[PDB]
Structure formats: C-alpha cells, structure tokens
Design a protein around this ligand. Sequence first.
Ligand code: COA
Ligand code: COA
Ligand code: COA
Ligand code: COA
Ligand code: RIO
Ligand code: RIO
Ligand code: RIO
Ligand code: RIO
Lengths: 261, 260, 261, 261
Amino acid sequence: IPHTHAHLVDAFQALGIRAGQALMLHASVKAVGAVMGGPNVILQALMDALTPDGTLMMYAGWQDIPDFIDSLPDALKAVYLEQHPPFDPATARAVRENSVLAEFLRTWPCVHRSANPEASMVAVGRQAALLTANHALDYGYGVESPLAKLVAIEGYVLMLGAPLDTITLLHHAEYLAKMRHKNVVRYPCPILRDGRKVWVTVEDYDTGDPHDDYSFEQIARDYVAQGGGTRGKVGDADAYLFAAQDLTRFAVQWLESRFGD
Amino acid sequence: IPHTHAHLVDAFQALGIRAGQALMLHASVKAVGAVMGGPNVILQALMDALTPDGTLMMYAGWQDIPDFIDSLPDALKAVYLEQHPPFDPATARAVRENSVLAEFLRTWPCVHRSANPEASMVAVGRQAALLTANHALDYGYGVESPLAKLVAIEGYVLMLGAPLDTITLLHHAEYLAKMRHKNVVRYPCPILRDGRKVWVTVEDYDTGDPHDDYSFEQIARDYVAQGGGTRGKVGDADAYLFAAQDLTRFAVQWLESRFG
Amino acid sequence: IPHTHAHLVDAFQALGIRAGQALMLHASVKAVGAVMGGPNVILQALMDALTPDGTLMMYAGWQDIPDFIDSLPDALKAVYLEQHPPFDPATARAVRENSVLAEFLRTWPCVHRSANPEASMVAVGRQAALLTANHALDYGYGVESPLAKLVAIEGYVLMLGAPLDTITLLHHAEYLAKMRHKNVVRYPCPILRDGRKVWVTVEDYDTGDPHDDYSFEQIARDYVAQGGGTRGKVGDADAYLFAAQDLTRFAVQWLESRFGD
Amino acid sequence: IPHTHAHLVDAFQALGIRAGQALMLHASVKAVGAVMGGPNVILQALMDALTPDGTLMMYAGWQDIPDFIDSLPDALKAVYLEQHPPFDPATARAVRENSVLAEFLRTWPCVHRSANPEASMVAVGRQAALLTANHALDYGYGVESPLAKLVAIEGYVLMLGAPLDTITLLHHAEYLAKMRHKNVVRYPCPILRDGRKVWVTVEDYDTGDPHDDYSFEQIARDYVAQGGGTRGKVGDADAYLFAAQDLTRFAVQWLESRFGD
Ligand SMILES: CC(C)(COP(=O)(O)OP(=O)(O)OC[C@H]1O[C@@H](n2cnc3c(N)ncnc32)[C@H](O)[C@@H]1OP(=O)(O)O)[C@@H](O)C(=O)NCCC(=O)NCCS
Ligand SMILES: CC(C)(COP(=O)(O)OP(=O)(O)OC[C@H]1O[C@@H](n2cnc3c(N)ncnc32)[C@H](O)[C@@H]1OP(=O)(O)O)[C@@H](O)C(=O)NCCC(=O)NCCS
Ligand SMILES: CC(C)(COP(=O)(O)OP(=O)(O)OC[C@H]1O[C@@H](n2cnc3c(N)ncnc32)[C@H](O)[C@@H]1OP(=O)(O)O)[C@@H](O)C(=O)NCCC(=O)NCCS
Ligand SMILES: CC(C)(COP(=O)(O)OP(=O)(O)OC[C@H]1O[C@@H](n2cnc3c(N)ncnc32)[C@H](O)[C@@H]1OP(=O)(O)O)[C@@H](O)C(=O)NCCC(=O)NCCS
Ligand SMILES: NC[C@H]1O[C@H](O[C@H]2[C@H](O[C@@H]3O[C@H](CO)[C@@H](O)[C@H]3O)[C@@H](O)[C@H](N)C[C@@H]2N)[C@H](N)[C@@H](O)[C@@H]1O
Ligand SMILES: NC[C@H]1O[C@H](O[C@H]2[C@H](O[C@@H]3O[C@H](CO)[C@@H](O)[C@H]3O)[C@@H](O)[C@H](N)C[C@@H]2N)[C@H](N)[C@@H](O)[C@@H]1O
Ligand SMILES: NC[C@H]1O[C@H](O[C@H]2[C@H](O[C@@H]3O[C@H](CO)[C@@H](O)[C@H]3O)[C@@H](O)[C@H](N)C[C@@H]2N)[C@H](N)[C@@H](O)[C@@H]1O
Ligand SMILES: NC[C@H]1O[C@H](O[C@H]2[C@H](O[C@@H]3O[C@H](CO)[C@@H](O)[C@H]3O)[C@@H](O)[C@H](N)C[C@@H]2N)[C@H](N)[C@@H](O)[C@@H]1O
C-alpha cells in the first residue's frame, strides 16, 4: 500500500528525470503520501533515477540563524552576541519550513554543503562539490551561488508536491533582472573563521518579500501556461519539472517586462 | 561698528575660555553679527583665547555623502556606485548645516581631520592630531571617536549662537547610555583605501532621530536649569560653555533614568 | 610504432580518467614517447576521455616575465621599465619548463586563460571559464586562484611522465598551511590596464624556494606511499592520477605536522 | 654628586620635553649615572616634566615568553605546554634587556598595560589607556598597536643613554614599508581567556632579525645625520628626542628606497 522505491523511481523517470542531470528538489513529504521506508526512500529513489552521475541539491538554510537581533531590546541583543552559536556547517540544522527532506539530505552520506548560512545549499552526487563551492556570503542568490551554477550546467528544478511559490531559483532571477527597485537587506550573522566565532554583516536582496507586485506562484503559473516544464504524479503528489536555464530566462524577461526601468 | 578680533577674544575669555583648553565649537555666523574681517576672525579670536597650547575642533561631516543610494532606482544607484567620488579628507566639503565655520576650520592651516566620513571632525591646535586620530568608521560617536577623547581630556563645548539641539557630543551620550532599544543603521559609503575607491558598509546608531521620546534641546535645557555650564554674550550671540565630561555624565544619567 | 589516439584514450580511461572530470595536467612529451600526430594527439586524446563536459587545465605562467628587474642597475632597470612588453594574455608565451604541452594548450581553440601573469593557468572545457575567472594578482596560488577552485569543485591532477616535484597544486597547500615561517615577496610586473601598459607590484608567497625544510617530491612520494592516487602506464610514461582535494588535504596536514602550530 | 629630581626635570625640559606630550622612553640606568633616589626618580622627573596631562610609555614585553618551544624536543615541548604559566598582565615581568626602568614603569601606580604578550607596552598618564587599548595579538608592531597610536597622536621617542638600534618604533616602520622580502613567523604563546590558560598561535613579522640587509642603528644614525630630532645631556647620558611621526615617515622612506617597489 505505501509507495515503493521502484514505483517512485519510475514516477520520477516518467516526469523526464534522466541519468546525469543536476536537480534541485522542493518537496512536501505529506503531499507524496506514505512511502515504504519513509522519506529516505524519496531521496534514494530520486538519486537512483539520477544515477551516481547525477546530482541532487536542496536549499537547507539555517533554522536558528539570529538575523533578527537588531529588533530585540539592546540588553537581549548583547546576550545573543555573546552566547548564540555561530553557523557551523557540520551541525547547523536546515530550516524546518524547507521540508524535513532538506534536513534528511543535509545529513546524507557524501553530502556537500555551501558556506552561506542563510542561503546554504546541500547536494549529493557527481557535481555536488561544484554546485556548493565558493558560495559568497553577500548576495547569496546571485552570480557566485549554487543557483548560478545550476543554471550554468543546465540543471533542473523538481517541485514534488511543493507550492510553486517556493521555487528558490526565482530569487536568482530577481537578482539578475533589471528591475526598477529592489530592496537590499543588511543583517548580522555569526560564522566560523579560523575555528572561532565572528559576527559579520551580510548584504543581500530581500528574499522574504517580493521587490514589486508579483509572486513566484504567478511567474511559475505563467511559465506552465505557455508550455514550460513537465507535469505528473509522484506518489500522491502533483509534480512539476522545470529546466533551470529556460525558467530563469523566462522569469527574468517576465520581471523586466513588468517592473523594469 | 563690526565686532573686532580683540573684542571677540575678550568676550571668549570673559565667558571662561582659558589657555590650553580643548574646545569643540557649534556656531551661527549670523547670530554673532558682523565681524571685522569675517568669520575667519571668529576662529582666530577663539584660537587666540585658547593659545597654541589649546585645541579647537568642529564637526565637519561630508556634505555630499551618498548614504541614501539604496532608496534610489536600481539603475541610478548603479551610476552612483560607478561615478560618485569617494570621501577624500583633503577635499570633502563640510556639511553646510554644520555652519560655514566648520568648512572654514576644515581648510585652516595645520588642520587635522578624522577619517569617518559621516562623523568627520576637524581640529587645529596642540591636541588636534590626538582628537582626530583613529576615528572608527562604525559607531562614529562611540568609544573610538573624537568625542570620547574630548571627554577623556576634560574638554569643553562652546555654543556660539547655535541651537542647543545641535550639540553633537550628546550623540556620544546616546552611544554610552544603557537604553531599552537603540536603532542601528547600516549604510553604504565610498572611501579611499590604498588610494583606490572602495564602497564599504558603515554601521552606526541612528543619529538623525532619537532612540526614544526625547530631544537634545530638552536634555541641554534641563542641564542648564540645574546649574550646568556658563552663559554669556559673544558679539550679538547668546553663548553657552559646557564641560564635556559633566555634560556627558548628566546626559547619560538623564537618558538611562528615563529610557533604561 | 608511435602511440595512437585510440590507444592513448584507452590508457587514460584505464588509469581512471572519466567523463566530466576537471583535470590539471603535468606532462613530459619525451616520457610518453613518439605519438602518431605529435603532442596535439596527447591533448585531444585526454580531452576525448574527459568529453566536452570535462575540463583540462595546465599551468602556463609567462616565459618572459621580468620579475627580476629589481636586481639590475638603475640604468638597465629604466630600459626594462620603458621597453619590456606587458603581459598580454593573447600572446604571452608559456614557461618552457612547464612543458611544450602547456604552450600547445594555451593556443588551443576555445581556451580560457587566467589573468595572473606569473601564475597564469589555461583551460579548455566546460568549467574552463569558471576555473580561470577572477585570478587575483596577489597570492596567485591562494584563495583567489584556479588551484583553489580546482580543489573546491573536486578536480584531479594527472602526472604524465612529469616528476612529482612539479605539482603546482602543492603551492596552494603551502598557502593554506599554517607554518612557523613563510617568505613573502613583492616583485614588479608589466600588465595591460585599459589597453595600456602599466607596471604593478605583485605580492605573493615565495614559490621559488620552500618556506622550510621540505620538498614537493618528498610530500608527493609520501602521499603515494600511504595509498594516495592511482598509477598506470600511458604510452611509455609512468602516470599518476590524484584527487585534488585529497592531495591538498594530505599536503596541508603534512606541512602543519612538521612546521605548524 | 648623585643627580637630583630637580636637575633631571630641568634637563628633560631643556632637551625639549613639554607638558602634555606622549613619550616613549628607551633608557640605560647606568648611562644616566647615579640618581638621588634611584631609577624611580628618573621616571618621576620625566612624569613631572610631562605633567599628568602627558603620557610616558615603555616596551615591556614578557621576559619569560615561551615563544621558542617549537625548537625543543617533543618531550620537553610537552612539559612546557602542560606547565608553563600563561601571560598574566598583572605579573608578567618585563624583558630584562628592555631596561629595569621598563619593569619599574610596569609596576608604577596607575599603569596601563597592552594585551599583546610579546609586544606588551606599559604606560602612565592621560593617554595611557588610549595607547594600550585593543593591542591585537597578531602583528603586534602593526596597525593595531600602541606604536601606531603613538604616531597617530603625534607622540615622541626619548633615547636616554640607550643605543639607537633599540628604537622599537622602527619595527612599526618595518610593518608599514612595502619591501621586496618579509619574514612572517607563527609562534605559540599561553594567555588567559576567561580566567583560564589557553595556548594560542601568534602571527607576526619576524622582529628578531631584519627583513633585509639593514639595521635600525643605520636608519637612526642617518635620521640624526640629516637633522632629525634634538640632542642633549640628561645626567651623564647622551639623550635624543625624536618626533614619532617624522621618524616613522623617514624610516619607511629609507626602507622603501633601498628595498621597496
Ligand atoms: C512547508 C512544507 C515543507 C510543509 O510540507 P509538509 O509535507 O507538511 O512537511 P515536510 O515535507 O517537512 O514533512 C513533514 C512530515 O514528514 C514525516 N516524516 C516521516 N519520517 C519522519 C522523520 N524521521 N522525522 C520527521 N518527520 C518524518 C512526518 O509525517 C512529518 O509530518 P509531521 O511532523 O506532521 O508528523 C511544504 O508545504 C513546502 O512548502 N515545501 C517546499 C519547501 C521549500 O522548498 N521552501 C524553499 C524556501 S521558500
Ligand atoms: C544651521 C545654522 C548653521 C545656520 O546658522 P547661520 O548663521 O545662518 O549659517 P552660518 O553659520 O553657516 O553662516 C552663514 C553666513 O556666513 C556669512 N559669510 C561671511 N563670509 C562668508 C564667506 N566667505 N563665505 C560664505 N559665507 C560667508 C554669510 O553671510 C552667510 O550667510 P548667507 O549665505 O545667508 O549670506 C545654525 O542655526 C546652526 O544650527 N549652527 C550649529 C550647527 C551645528 O553645529 N550642527 C551640528 C550637527 S547637528
Ligand atoms: C621539464 C620537462 C617539461 C621536460 O620534459 P620534456 O619531455 O623534455 O619536454 P616537453 O614536455 O616540453 O616536450 C618537448 C619535446 O616535445 C617534442 N615536440 C613534438 N612536437 C613538437 C613541436 N611542434 N614543437 C616543439 N616540440 C615538439 C620535441 O621532441 C621536444 O623535445 P626537443 O626540443 O628536445 O626536441 C619535464 O621534465 C617536466 O618537468 N614536466 C612537468 C613540467 C611542469 O608541469 N612544471 C610545473 C611547474 S614546477
Ligand atoms: C641593555 C641596556 C638596558 C643595558 O643598560 P643598563 O644601564 O646596563 O641596564 P638597566 O637600564 O636595566 O639598569 C640596570 C641597573 O639599574 C641599577 N639599579 C638601581 N636600582 C635598582 C634596583 N632596585 N633594582 C635593580 N637595579 C637597580 C642597577 O645599577 C642595575 O645595574 P646592575 O644590575 O649591574 O647593578 C641598555 O644598553 C639598552 O639597550 N637600553 C635600551 C633598551 C630598550 O629599550 N630595548 C627595546 C627593545 S630592542
Ligand atoms: N519564495 C517565497 C517564499 O518567501 C518566504 O520564504 C523565504 C524566506 O523568508 C523567510 O521566511 C521567514 C518568515 O517566514 C522570514 O525570516 C523570512 O526571512 C527567506 O528568508 C529565504 N531566504 C527564502 C524563502 N523563499 C516565505 N516564508 C515563503 O512562504 C514563501 O513561499
Ligand atoms: N539630534 C538633533 C540633531 O539631529 C539632526 O542632525 C544630525 C544629522 O541628521 C541629519 O539631519 C538631516 C535632517 O536635516 C537628516 O539628513 C539627517 O540625516 C546626522 O547626519 C548627524 N550624524 C548628526 C546630526 N546631529 C538634525 N538635522 C539636527 O537639526 C538636530 O540638531
Ligand atoms: N616547488 C617545486 C618547483 O619549484 C620551482 O618551480 C617554480 C618556479 O620557480 C622558478 O623556478 C626557479 C627555480 O626555482 C625560481 O628562481 C623561480 O624563478 C616558480 O616561478 C613558479 N611560481 C612555480 C614553479 N613550481 C622549480 N624550478 C621546479 O623545478 C620545482 O618543480
Ligand atoms: N631592534 C633591534 C633589537 O633586536 C633585538 O631585540 C628585539 C627582540 O629580539 C629578540 O631578541 C633575541 C635575540 O636578539 C631574538 O631571538 C629575538 O627573539 C624581539 O623579540 C622584540 N620583538 C623586539 C626587539 N627589538 C635585540 N635583542 C636588540 O639588542 C636589538 O637592538
């Protein structure tokens, strides 16, 4: 009754997932429904469809990032600066709202993790080191990011029962697009440097709210409506498979046509 | 008859300015009235009362600091990033609202200027290098600032027809005071590093608005009312002379009792 | 009698070269022996084993870099400052001792060349632009170098009859290693800036002599002795294939255990 | 016969010492000759000429710093790591070859001491806390040092029968100067961190030998020969009074003209 590994492998393949692809996954475990062996089998089935020559990536981030401390009373901020642990990539837990699957992949054998705390990506497979390498602290969805590299190697994005609003790649499209105005955020973050905690200022485009009157769901819905991507069932979940290069190109043109200067 | 150099020196001495003091000036040229020789003579008369063993300092800042570029359209901000000049302490003009006297002092012979663009101070005299040295870019009114040093050497603040709301030293009291919440700002600024332009992020407490329900004029008036400072006329101007250490102590206690 | 293209491809594959790898080559043409078609066929056979989704990189440097002029009399120095040509990446010849194969690759179609004159790297393939981008003038074997990026994307080093003392990647290990003594040098170099010749000063760790009592031969031989890398014949040449990340990690530990904190 | 407090005060004033100056002293007690009350009176007379508005600073260092332990056998090194006391600024004795006057000033009432063990400075007076604050452990004669601050506040250096080779400020000139070769060292040191002994590694330019073919004696003699500073007798001692800013500028130009870019 629960979905089997073999059936999930074939369901992923039916969508168009092929040996050797680099793929970034957004998922809802509940949407897929009961799997025989639990969410590990979702990851393993996807890895098997990709084969060891492919690569699987997820957005992990950092569940406990203390980027809000300026909003606290001064005396409480002082305690955070002294007592909050730094981002340690070996232990920093994935953002829970990024799916438990991101935390499962973060702790998978042979995983690689990128160094930007807020934008941290985890990946397993042939190009996992490449995708996660040299992730700049500032503008973490920009040109020196795993999203840029995913576009460059013509990777894919799989939404597995995940809302279309959660496509992290579209923050890279926001970065690229010549828009009339984008909101810049600067926030403190503790990191490790020579094995010691250092608080640094991170600069980035706001990724919590859009820069103008749009949503990622709207961009993705328009992409699908004009023939973009493939769609199909995986377990109980509605799934969408997008080519990163074409989706990014479409999204940049979409933003610039509506909100450019 | 326009006010003379001698009459200004004498009025400065009558108010309590003494040889060897370190003094930070806030002024209105218009409030002083016509001076024989112009605003140079205000500066020179004050320097003469201080003698070369004293020191005179003003808050210059940078009139053209482009700290607002994040609010501009992205395409315009890109042009600023490419074309706006960096803070060059040799040429960066003083904020006009800090008085033309601050720009006059900034271009005075033997002046020293501190390196923080937004908070830049200029000084002439025996301790001018000391006061302006190693002015940190972040928290420019804090521990690594000319204001901290002015307090440490028990200097003075002279208000020469300037409103009591303009006492820059009270931003140092804000920095020191343990208050429930202070607003932190981070803003971009172009500077010179190894002779090349570099854009850096500056972090500071907000100095454009108070951190709570107060004004500097309110603090200063309360200080005067409880016997703080000396008052007198210099030219046509109402003048106030404050000890930096006592005013800072008072303002920190004032802030902490109300907002701590 | 001469080695054929097909036999060289087979030998590279037997050694462990795989499609998609990013590979840095050190070679001796003489050690390989006569090849049917000459040294071009060595490069093409290696590129074929790597496929277009792989990358081949070599250290080119600049045969005629005038980094020695501070030692000359002022009058001769003035002539160098006036008359020596700048580093032009389109024409600057590779160091002859880096093998003629480095000069052959530098002039190969679709090559990318990194901008640091003394440390210039040349590469052909899918990650060639990535590896050669933004190569800082200072500390050219350091954090901003193609060697750092080769480690970060988990590339490989192939020794094709080249002595183990010539592994340029070990200068990156010297840069990373925390050691009791380092020599820092500053030297002059003419470059092109806005189409004009400009003399700049480059700061780097000394790469002409070791920083302490060791040799690269010593480190690499120890690496092999503990099971590092794979070995085999390619043509007449003894070949070694090393993982860049594992060799660098080993060499940093080797240096730090003897001269470190 | 023994020099009196009053006659030292007069001699310091005749040399050019003035109220309010920040002054770094290098001294020989024997060169001054017998003082009525002993070396305390040298320090007190100098403080009196400076007044409490002035500041007197000396290089104390740490007589017992175990910065040499990497050269010992592993077994003896092990005992040092276990048993050597940490740098405690309250008790760490001044280097004996820095003059007993440095230890006398280190134990003077109201003294402030900078935190860098090897480069520790002690000071008494109005800018004593300023000069000694935030003395970084790495590059202790560099930008984050009391010597940098002495230059910035336009202080002075007084040589009181001390050899001209002993001007510690010239290590700051070495740090600033752009030079063809520098030696960088890393050495161990035990310090206090949250009241517990911790061993750290300090990185600095070598200050035990020059970076090139020069001595501080040469630089200082050349400075004096071109009119730098003021000279006079204090007690039996030849004294020199130098402006820290002018001497540092001269020394940096001297080094860069001979060994610079
Ligand atoms: C928010 C969102 C993750 C919620 O989806 P979800 O299916 O409810 O949550 P998850 O995918 O984390 O799965 C949670 C379920 O995994 C199940 N599960 C199975 N084994 C588990 C295990 N060892 N440990 C924990 N949970 C386990 C549990 O049933 C758990 O549900 P429960 O806590 O209610 O018992 C989803 O709507 C979504 O948005 N996904 C895309 C997220 C994304 O990629 N965001 C990018 C940034 S915008
Ligand atoms: C805002 C404030 C400066 C305005 O006072 P003000 O007397 O009108 O202005 P200034 O002191 O700059 O003097 C300007 C006058 O100097 C005169 N002046 C004389 N010689 C001059 C010269 N060579 N060049 C320019 N102006 C000259 C001019 O008459 C000029 O007035 P005008 O342009 O209207 O003709 C004053 O109210 C104030 O706040 N002073 C304190 C400022 C301060 O210290 N702020 C700290 C940060 S909060
Ligand atoms: C120094 C070293 C290159 C010498 O090896 P080598 O085989 O003698 O020299 P090369 O690899 O340059 O091959 C030269 C041969 O290529 C041959 N060749 C074939 N076609 C050629 C052509 N069109 N043009 C020139 N030479 C050609 C020639 O026989 C030439 O030898 P020759 O000039 O004596 O006739 C080798 O010992 C070595 O150290 N390799 C590693 C180099 C390195 O990577 N260094 C990194 C910095 S330490
Ligand atoms: C090395 C140098 C200090 C030797 O000078 P010195 O006059 O022989 O030594 P000191 O200045 O330490 O004075 C020591 C004398 O102080 C006298 N003294 C007086 N009271 C004393 C007391 N309570 N306790 C100890 N000594 C006392 C003693 O005569 C002692 O000499 P002694 O042990 O032979 O009896 C001197 O040549 C020098 O180089 N000074 C500059 C040092 C410097 O600043 N170095 C910076 C780093 S390069
Ligand atoms: N792609 C649109 C999404 O925006 C928000 O999630 C973003 C997230 O926003 C955070 O959400 C927290 C509060 O929910 C804040 O701390 C924010 O920083 C941001 O910090 C990440 N860098 C990227 C995430 N995409 C929304 N939470 C999500 O529901 C929505 O689908
Ligand atoms: N706290 C009282 C004072 O605050 C403001 O001046 C501050 C000033 O704030 C600017 O004032 C402008 C409003 O005209 C804004 O651009 C602000 O950025 C800030 O740039 C300086 N760092 C410190 C100045 N004290 C007031 N201008 C001044 O009139 C008043 O006396
Ligand atoms: N570390 C091992 C290697 O070091 C030297 O080659 C280096 C080379 O050194 C030059 O060669 C001369 C002899 O050392 C120096 O004077 C420099 O000009 C240097 O310029 C490059 N930056 C890197 C090269 N690896 C050796 N020449 C080389 O044979 C040896 O394999
Ligand atoms: N500035 C020149 C001076 O160098 C030496 O003293 C230096 C001292 O050098 C040590 O002294 C040992 C032998 O000289 C070295 O091994 C170092 O550890 C060094 O540790 C300090 N950081 C700075 C001192 N200046 C000389 N002791 C001194 O006589 C000479 O005049």
